Amino acid sequence: VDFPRSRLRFKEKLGEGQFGEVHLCEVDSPQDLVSPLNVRKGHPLLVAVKILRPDATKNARNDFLKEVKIMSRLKDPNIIRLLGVCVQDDPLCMITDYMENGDLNQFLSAHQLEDKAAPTISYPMLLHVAAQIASGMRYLATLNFVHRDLATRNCLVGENFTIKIADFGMSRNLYAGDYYRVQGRAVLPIRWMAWECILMGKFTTASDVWAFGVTLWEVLMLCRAQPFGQLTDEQVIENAGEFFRDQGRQVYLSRPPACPQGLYELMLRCWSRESEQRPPFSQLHRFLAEDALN
Ligand SMILES: O=C(c1ccc2[nH]ncc2c1)N1CCC2(CC1)C(=O)N(Cc1nc(C3CC3)no1)CN2c1ccccc1
């Protein structure tokens, strides 16, 4: 059942993509449509809508139709959700919740750790942000779904520090420095990648755990610094080789200022050479949710 396209009212542009756009839209007369949405009375219902340009290539339309298939199965509080589609006619549309605070890298960058002595954020809230990401990945693991590009730039933030995992792709200018590009090869977020992904292209739930470790390091750094930021792309790839050789010469991300040694030891577990020794997301969530409880 197509969402009624006529009820979508443009407001502003959230994203310029290569073959489409993401727009912020209001939903005209929202009460008629509620079954999958929830709207407070007398307030504007805002949604994000990904629209395929109606003259986009056949390749682009194919990729869009597959993304609809993938999005359709995602049903978890910490993964973005498909509210509806308009695909029986053109332009093809997907609809999702509006997350008013944008991506998590930009959001956290504007905050400082609160000073007990005295926009800020507390240590327990940082853990709450991290645990929501772990819960989202826990869900994806039960689907045997491998993300392949977990990073704070790919998470969205709503009200009250709620987090949802997304996947923007790798084309945004703002994050060009986070990807390694070689002609004729896949574009690769090497600073977030397990050693076996870099050397063999093997992406698994276990390499998603490695990437979660880096993502947790980002959060505890308040997104103030790039992983391995003082090293070149070449040195990061060479480091992957040192994990393989296993002669004690591989290096790790350092402990953030806001990060206690216990939590750092969890990050190091996420970066275990052997993929089967890395913790499952069910245990990562538990650790982080306990600590954030008090
Ligand atoms: O530009 C934005 C954006 C910016 C600011 C915003 N604030 N509030 C909302 C919002 C949206 N994007 C984020 C959402 C987006 C398009 C890019 C996306 O990363 N998609 C692919 C995807 N795959 C997965 C699976 C791994 C879980 N999750 O997402 C699909 N997806 C999307 C967007 C709109 C409707 C339907 C899908």
* Strand residue runs (E) in 143-190: 155-157, 163-165
From 63, 103, 115, 149, active-site residue = 149
Q: How many CB atoms lie within 10 A of CB 33?
A: 17
Instruction: Tell which one of 27, 64, 168 to mutate to probe ligand 1, the residue whose CB is within 8 A of the most ligand atoms.
Output: 168
Which amino acid makes up residue 252? Y
Residues in the chain: 294
Domain with CATH 1.10.510.10 in the chain: 99-291
Which positions ≥6 away from 280 have C-beta within 8 Å? 138, 141, 209
Query: CA 278, CA 218: separation in Å to the nearest integer?
Result: 19
Distances (CA, A) of 260 to 127, 263, 265, 271: 12, 6, 9, 17
**Cβ of residue 215 lying under 6 Å from some atom of ligand 1:** no
The resolution, in angstroms to one decimal, equals 1.7
Which of 210, 112, 209, 99 is CA-nearest to residue 162?
A: 99
| End-to-end alpha carbon distance in the chain | 45
Atom nearest to 147 CA in ligand 1: 26
- Is 84 annotated as ligand-binding? no
**Cβ of residue 156 lying under 6 Å from some atom of ligand 1:** yes
Q: State the sign of the Cα–Cα–Cα–Cα dihedral 169, 217, 136, 205.
A: positive
Q: Could you tell me which CATH number the domain at 1-98 has?
A: 3.30.200.20
Which positions ≥6 away from 60 have C-beta within 8 Å? 18, 19, 20, 52, 53
Decide if 222 contacts 108 (C-beta within 8 A). yes
Q: Is 149 a catalytic residue?
A: yes
Query: CA 164, CA 111: separation in Å to the nearest integer?
Result: 19
Atom nearest to 99 CA in ligand 1: 8
∠ CA 212-214-219 to the nearest 5 degrees? 90
**Cβ of residue 52 lying under 6 Å from some atom of ligand 1:** no
Domain with CATH 3.30.200.20 in the chain: 1-98
Q: State the sign of the Cα–Cα–Cα–Cα dihedral 99, 210, 149, 176.
A: positive
* Strand residue runs (E) in the chain: 8-16, 20-27, 46-52, 84-86, 93-97, 112-113, 120-121, 155-157, 163-165
Right CATH for 99-291 from 3.30.413.10, 1.10.510.10, 3.30.465.10, 3.40.50.620: 1.10.510.10
Method used experimentally: X-ray
